[PDB]
């Protein structure tokens, strides 16, 4: 009656509250909550990024536009000349050449008190690579730089003889990309690169900031290469599927031949523009499990040099921010909270449950 | 005797230790502990700040001081000229004018592979605003910029004809303030602004760092607008209550007329200085629940322009630090810890407590 | 039989699982896990670092090398002249003098609206200090600057008469070190200092980032001074134990006399170099419990000055990152987890254990 009814009410209230708490915990585990731990991991060997050093886009280029005007065309219609038998799109995109052979990058690491800065010229030297911006040079930046001092830079240089044989370049475009993803160089160097003047010797400082996202069912992260591969394939195919044609331009990898018709070359170029502008939205990939963020700030330099193009990139800060989205609510945590709630709104343990099971088996 | 006494001692020891633990937890709840979670929230649309671009203070101004000397006064006593019938303090503070009509700011966002930076001149254009520094221009920066590339800037310009009709300005002062807080522009632009020369076309970069403080009884936070209203009202009334007079100067909002006596104008100016210097201490309000921190670092530019005043403000970094001081020890946390401690130094649950209550009711 | 055997199996399973959990918790406490809390502590009084402003290393020095060539030596063998009776290594290292007497540094903090920047020249003035780089000047930077505005700098200057009596210096070397740690200035100023030209008046901005490491058995942290003392002692004695000689050069503390033989002076200089490049490895100390990281970024200035050497160091950012590695698994945490696991896989409380003890005592 009274007593039994109230006892049943209380017991059912206890089970109801425990079940509601456990259900909320279970629903919390299904949607993995994520927190971020940010620490500064000082490393002695800095992983230098792979600098891309492009000229300004053909339209904004000085020397290439000068050649196009010499042939008698305006700053726009240089693709109305490629299928001319000798210009051979390869030789059109060789007219954007802003760097000459002598390009070489050194890797100064220390400072020394007798000799001076440790000039180490055996580091991976730069190679010329085609890009939407034209014909650039990619800085491999392969081996790591042993950070010792605030004077730890790679000094790119080019001693192109600047005699009055033809007008000479005004500025270049610098983009700091990651080791071996080919879409960063050949496509995204006209957008994400800094336009800086070669008239005077210009420097940089780079502080590295790394964001890491954990694998998670409702927000997955792919490794370094797989995102690059998916994005590059998307960009190359939709150029084809958005130009509704079949041919390529130097910045594309050798799938098909080189557009033996100017209208199709223009279609490819325009589709490239349209897809590169907004491949973040149209794509279906997500940021890597790592995310390098180079905080590139400028500086003045300590000495002049009569060199056509000069460039320093300082890495004086060896403490790198490391954000790491991580697993904050594990399955062990769920089981422990379930145990806590069943032992807090009750007296049930993992020994009483087995004891009742034993009683069931008589 | 022995056994009963020791049993009572043990029971009271357990009960007392549990009570001490619960009391410490309760006292931990009253003084809300606060932790901070720092994450990088990459946004595609950067919320550009409202740039204020003032000339140097009258004393340090070039052209205004030249006018004052022409009238036959020193670079301190220009307030001994305002109540002259025609100079009409408004027309005294129109002599600080460093910008001319033509002022217009554009918003380059993309980079493009043919055209170049996407010039979008339809954005909020700048308007002239009076300030303690004189007559300035405030950059509304209303619409957000769709971050795409590291070339995403708003370029302020002014093509004032620099003919030899009168000496021309040397430098300006830029202050980066939030959308619609009127105390920032009119008062705190002579203090918190960067003094940078207009001789050469200069550029800026800005990385946003946002600190969020949680509402908390012993350290409250007000929203964006309320703190600005508090500070502005305090600054304006104290100028009045610290000058012990009743009149205003152009930078103050239209409460009272324009100081038809030079001594009171000087009183107002001096009180304004003395209050803006130290309104942080005398005030009785606390920083917002949000706290935008623009990390303004300098750089060089990629192209010259024969324009009287030229300015770029780059926004190449979309990852923004977000510190969020938050509630770390909730009321549910206190209840669960109380349950844990009463079930760890005892065998009491919310089913045994109700059972004992039922036993009490017989 | 059946029932008793299964009951024993269940009881032993519960005991084993509880013991495994408790052992894992205990081993988790023995290897203290460490997490980092990063908050921005708005500080009104910025603790300015102790700037060291050295000339470039002797061989890279202009004026000192000019003197060496005048005496008839190359820019390497200036130590083949020290024990000449009058050059008296002290007077060899007085030839690197790049600053003249008139050196004085001010501390501008505010901006003001009438007067202008608050020049406060009574702050600690600079003194000349010997260093491997030569004869430098050290900026005491003793009192803190009351941060008020984005114009809070200490402007170093030197008005040495630049008449055509002798060729004049090209650049200096700036190194930002902590208040009273003597191994920084005298040894690590040729390595960790920025080489920046004096030709034009340059400015600096510095944002402070502080990393704190908690004292911990398997990775101890010493206070600010003890690490500096240990590193200085190691560097100075190894120079002696690595040069296998007994004498010193001006940058060393007055332990022994000044190397009255050039071969020993060269031995000391070479041993110095060799140890300073790699004292991080050979030493046996670890980073302090403090770690100040000055984020020195460059910029332009607001006004020229016909001064031989001019320098600003802006401190416009009062929000300082404070990473604090801390104790995440306390002893109370271990005890509470042990209680939770023994009350979750069992029904044991701290009252039932005492009850069983009482039963033992009959």
Asked whether residue A140 falls in the same domain as residue A251, the answer is no
Contact B134, B64 (CB under 8 A): yes
Helices within chain B (DSSP H only) = 2-30, 63-71, 182-186, 224-243, 262-277, 279-282, 331-344, 352-360
Contact A253, A131 (CB under 8 A): no
Q: Looking up tokens 């620490």, which residue turns up? A: A39
In this structure, what CATH number is given to the domain that contains residue B307? 2.60.470
Asked whether residue B183 falls in the same domain as residue B314, the answer is yes
Phi, psi of B303 (to 5 degrees): -160, 140
Q: How many Cα neighbours within 13 Å face the side chain of B233?
A: 8
Would residue C15 count as lying in a domain?
Answer: no
Resolution (A): 3.1
CA distance A318 to C192: 12
CA distance A348 to A346: 6
Distances (CA, A) of C62 to A201, A307, A329, C69, C170: 21, 22, 63, 11, 7
Neighboring chain B residues of A269 at a CB cutoff of 8 Å: 113-114
- Nearest CA-CA partner of B113 in A174, A136, A255, A131: A131
Asked whether residue B169 falls in the same domain as residue B302, the answer is yes
Q: Do B10 and C355 touch (CB under 8 A)?
A: yes
Query: Dihedral of the CA atoms C214, C215, C219, C220 (nearest 10)?
Result: 130
Asked whether residue A186 falls in the same domain as residue A253, the answer is no
Would residue B124 count as lying in a domain?
Answer: yes
CA distance B149 to A190: 9
The SS3 assignment for A75 reads coil
CB-based contacts of C164: which residues, under 8 Å, 6+ apart?
none
Q: Based on the number of CB atoms within 10 Å of its own CB, is A38 exposed (0-12), middle (13-18) or buried (19 or more)?
A: buried
Asked whether residue B187 falls in the same domain as residue B316, the answer is yes
Q: Looking up tokens 């903090």, which residue turns up? A: C109
* Among A residues 39-98, those touching chain C with beta carbons less than 8 Å apart: 39-40, 44
Range list of β-strands (E), C88-178: 104-108, 127-131, 134-138, 145-146, 153-158, 171-177
CA distance B73 to B68: 5
Would residue C291 count as lying in a domain?
Answer: yes
Assign residue A348 a region (left: φ > 0; alpha: ψ between -120 and 50; beta: otherwise): beta
Closest Cβ–Cβ partner in C110, C297, C354 for B14: C354
Query: How many residue pairs from chains A and C have C-beta atoms closer than 8 A?
Result: 115
- Nearest CA-CA partner of B200 in C312, C302, C198, A297: C302
Asked whether residue A121 falls in the same domain as residue A212, the answer is yes
Closest Cβ–Cβ partner in B40, B113, B207 for A273: B113
CA distance A42 to B117: 38
CA distance B138 to B239: 24
Contact C262, C238 (CB under 8 A): no
**CA-based angle B167:B168:B172, to the nearest 5?**
145
CB-based contacts of C236: which residues, under 8 Å, 6+ apart?
C252, C253, C255
- Nearest CA-CA partner of B224 in B105, B78, B50: B50
Q: Do A319 and C57 touch (CB under 8 A)?
A: no
* Structural tokens at position A141: 């930046």
Neighboring chain C residues of B38 at a CB cutoff of 8 Å: 38
Would residue A228 count as lying in a domain?
Answer: yes
* Structural tokens at position B238: 């104290």
CA distance B233 to B274: 15
The SS3 assignment for C173 reads strand
Q: Do A211 and B319 touch (CB under 8 A)?
A: yes
Residue of A nearest to C266 (CA): A114
Would residue C16 count as lying in a domain?
Answer: no
Asked whether residue B326 falls in the same domain as residue B185, the answer is yes
Asked whether residue A145 falls in the same domain as residue A194, the answer is yes
Would residue C35 count as lying in a domain?
Answer: no
CA distance B314 to B109: 10
Asked whether residue B280 falls in the same domain as residue B297, the answer is no
Closest Cβ–Cβ partner in B111, B207, B349 for A346: B349
- Given CB atoms, is B146 within the 8 Å cutoff of chain C? no
CA distance A103 to A53: 11
Asked whether residue B250 falls in the same domain as residue B107, the answer is no
* Structural tokens at position B40: 């990088």
CA distance A136 to A187: 12
Would residue A72 count as lying in a domain?
Answer: no
Asked whether residue A249 falls in the same domain as residue A311, the answer is no
Neighboring chain C residues of B190 at a CB cutoff of 8 Å: 111-113
Phi, psi of A77 (to 5 degrees): -95, 50
The SS3 assignment for B326 reads strand
Kind of pairing between the strands at A153-158 and A171-177 = unpaired
CB-based contacts of A168: which residues, under 8 Å, 6+ apart?
A62, A63, A160, A162, A308
Contact A69, A61 (CB under 8 A): no
Helices within chain C (DSSP H only) = 2-30, 63-71, 182-187, 224-243, 262-277, 279-282, 331-344, 352-360
CA distance A112 to C275: 11
* Structural tokens at position C44: 């009104």
Q: Do B300 and A196 touch (CB under 8 A)?
A: yes
CA distance B176 to C168: 41
Enclosing domain of residue C119 = 44-317
Contact C253, C229 (CB under 8 A): no
Experimental approach was cryo-EM
CA distance B17 to B345: 8
- Nearest CA-CA partner of A295 in C60, B78, B295, C170: B295
Asked whether residue B277 falls in the same domain as residue B327, the answer is no
Would residue A360 count as lying in a domain?
Answer: no
Contact A138, A189 (CB under 8 A): no
Helices within chain A (DSSP H only) = 2-30, 63-71, 182-186, 224-243, 262-277, 279-282, 331-344, 352-360
* Structural tokens at position B10: 């043990």
Please state the domain count of chain A.
2
Q: Looking up tokens 């006018």, which residue turns up? A: B67
Assign residue B259 a region (left: φ > 0; alpha: ψ between -120 and 50; beta: otherwise): left
Contact A277, B110 (CB under 8 A): yes
CA distance C231 to C253: 13
CA distance A314 to A107: 10
The SS3 assignment for A127 reads strand
CA distance B4 to B15: 16
Q: Do C293 and A319 touch (CB under 8 A)?
A: yes
Min Cα separation B80/chain A (Å): 45
């Amino acid at each position: 009656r009274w007593q039994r009814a109230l006892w049943f009410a209380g017991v059912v209230f206890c089970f109801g509250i425990s079940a509601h708490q456990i259900a909320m915990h279970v629903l919390d585990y299904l949607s993995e909550p994520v927190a971020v731990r940010i620490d500064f991991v000082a490393q002695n060997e800095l992983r230098i990024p792979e600098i891309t050093v492009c000229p300004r886009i053909f339209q904004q280029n000085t020397i290439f536009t000068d050649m196009v005007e010499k042939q008698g065309i305006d700053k726009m219609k240089f693709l109305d000349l490629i299928d001319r038998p000798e210009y051979d799109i390869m030789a059109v995109w060789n007219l954007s050449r802003i760097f000459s052979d002598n390009v070489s990058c050194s890797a100064h690491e220390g400072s020394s008190i007798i000799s001076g800065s440790y000039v180490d010229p055996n580091m991976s030297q730069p190679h010329l690579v085609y890009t939407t911006s034209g014909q650039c040079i990619n800085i491999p930046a392969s081996r790591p730089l042993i950070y010792r001092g605030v004077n730890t830079f790679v000094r790119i240089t080019d001693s192109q003889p600047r005699n009055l044989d033809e007008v000479r370049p005004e500025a270049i475009q610098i983009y700091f990309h990651e080791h071996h993803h080919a879409h960063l160089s050949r496509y995204l160097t006209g957008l994400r690169g800094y336009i800086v003047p070669i008239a005077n010797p210009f420097a940089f400082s780079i502080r590295f900031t790394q964001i890491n996202y954990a694998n998670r069912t409702d927000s997955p992260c792919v490794d370094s290469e797989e995102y690059a591969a998916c994005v590059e394939d998307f960009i190359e195919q939709r150029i084809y599927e958005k130009a509704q044609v079949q041919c390529r331009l130097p910045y594309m990898r050798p799938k098909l031949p080189l557009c033996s018709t100017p209208t199709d070359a223009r279609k490819i170029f325009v589709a490239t523009d349209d897809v590169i502008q907004n491949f973040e939205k149209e794509s279906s990939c997500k940021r890597k499990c790592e995310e390098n963020l180079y905080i590139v700030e400028f500086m003045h330099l300590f000495e002049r040099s009569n060199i056509s193009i000069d460039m320093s990139v300082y890495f004086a800060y060896n403490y790198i921010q490391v954000a790491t989205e991580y697993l904050t609510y594990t399955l062990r945590g769920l089981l422990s909270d379930i145990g806590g709630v069943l032992g807090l709104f009750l007296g049930i343990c993992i020994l009483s449950v087995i004891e009742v099971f034993e009683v069931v088996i008589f």
